[PDB]
Design a protein around this ligand. Structure first.
Ligand code: B1J
Ligand code: NI
Length: 341
């Protein structure tokens, strides 16, 4: 059964609700972004209207083979009417094509659904600035003060500098980056750019990246592994056994691997700075875990909510335990009182 927090009251709409069969009274299904926990259920046999971004629509058509007649892409930052209701899609600063959705109910209620997002002060000057929001359906992934991490810019500087140093010292070193979904493309693109290389990858991953409208992508990626010194592999293979195996397949072109795993949060953030990060090393293989997040830190989330001043908050992540729910509600009350309501 579909949970209450995926239903938009006073409308026929659901959000990220494709794994529940036919939802009673749902006339339009919104999809915030192409991550599997959110799209789970869609296929070529889906025959209800799906509303999403242009990039998300490209991925639905080409990767899941959803029929074109049921895909309804909408432009960003533009007032659109869907089944008699005004909606706007806003950039979520998550993965490519990820959106937040503003719904303007007929009775005057305004609802923001963040999907998955990384809150940023730039959002304080979108179409959100223009009106009051009554209800906020909030990505609470990291809603606890222990969740601190650096800016994406600081993390990319560390990765570029580390990779450039390693390959300048040893021109026969290979760089490997892990991936298991769209998002965090800057990690591998920025490293390839500083080394003067394209990023080599499987045919399936190249297909996925061709759906994303990234400027000059044909200039940065390839399926020719032999011509590339930055390789993408499945996240599951970023370990000493899997990387040893990959190195054998390169046929003596390389004698060292430097690998990156771009994880969300890892407790070592609590103790140390980005400048202080060190790898795990065995023989001629080193693995760096880097805290590249596409979700709000606690402080980023707090600032966004204190700026927006919603009347009601509905969490969409960590909702399955009473301890988690109680903890989040205590922070929401703190934020409200500190904002002086
Ligand atoms: O779900 C009820 C609710 C609303 N709020 C809230 C928090 C911060 C600000 Cl600034 C305004 C409202 N907290 N809990
Ligand atoms: Ni996501």
């Amino acid at each position: 059964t579909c949970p209450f927090y995926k239903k938009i009251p006073g409308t026929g709409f659901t959000v990220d609700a494709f794994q529940y069969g036919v939802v009673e009274g749902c006339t339009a299904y919104f999809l915030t972004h192409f991550h599997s926990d959110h799209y789970a259920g869609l296929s070529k046999h889906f025959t209800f209207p799906v509303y999403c971004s242009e990039i998300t629509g490209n991925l639905l058509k080409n990767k899941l083979h959803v029929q074109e007649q049921y895909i309804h892409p909408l432009p960003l930052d533009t007032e659109c009417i869907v089944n008699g209701v005004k909606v706007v899609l806003l950039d979520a600063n998550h993965c490519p094509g990820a959106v937040m959705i503003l719904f303007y109910l007929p009775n005057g209620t305004v609802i923001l659904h963040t999907g998955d997002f990384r809150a940023d002060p730039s959002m304080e000057r979108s179409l959100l600035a223009d009106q009051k929001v009554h209800m906020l359906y909030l990505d609470t992934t990291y809603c606890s003060p222990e969740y601190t991490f650096p800016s994406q810019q600081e993390v990319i500087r560390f990765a570029i500098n580390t990779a450039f140093e390693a390959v300048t010292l040893n021109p026969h070193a290979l760089v490997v980056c892990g991936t298991y979904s769209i998002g965090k493309e800057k990690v591998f693109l920025a490293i390839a750019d500083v080394l003067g290389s394209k990023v080599g990858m499987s045919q399936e991953k190249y297909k996925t990246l061709q759906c994303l409208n990234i400027p000059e992508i044909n200039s940065l990626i390839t399926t020719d592994m032999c011509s590339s010194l930055v390789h993408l592999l499945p996240m599951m293979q970023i370990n000493f056994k899997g990387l040893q195996s990959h190195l054998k397949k390169c046929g003596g072109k390389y004698n060292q691997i430097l690998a990156f795993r771009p994880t969300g949060w890892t407790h070592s953030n609590k103790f140390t700075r980005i400048a202080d990060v060190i790898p795990q090393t065995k023989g001629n293989i080193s693995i760096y875990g880097i805290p590249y997040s596409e979700h709000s830190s606690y402080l980023e989330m707090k600032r966004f909510v204190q700026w927006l001043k919603p009347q009601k908050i509905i969490p969409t992540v960590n909702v399955g335990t009473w301890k988690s729910r109680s903890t989040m509600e205590k922070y929401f009350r703190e934020w409200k009182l500190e904002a002086g309501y």
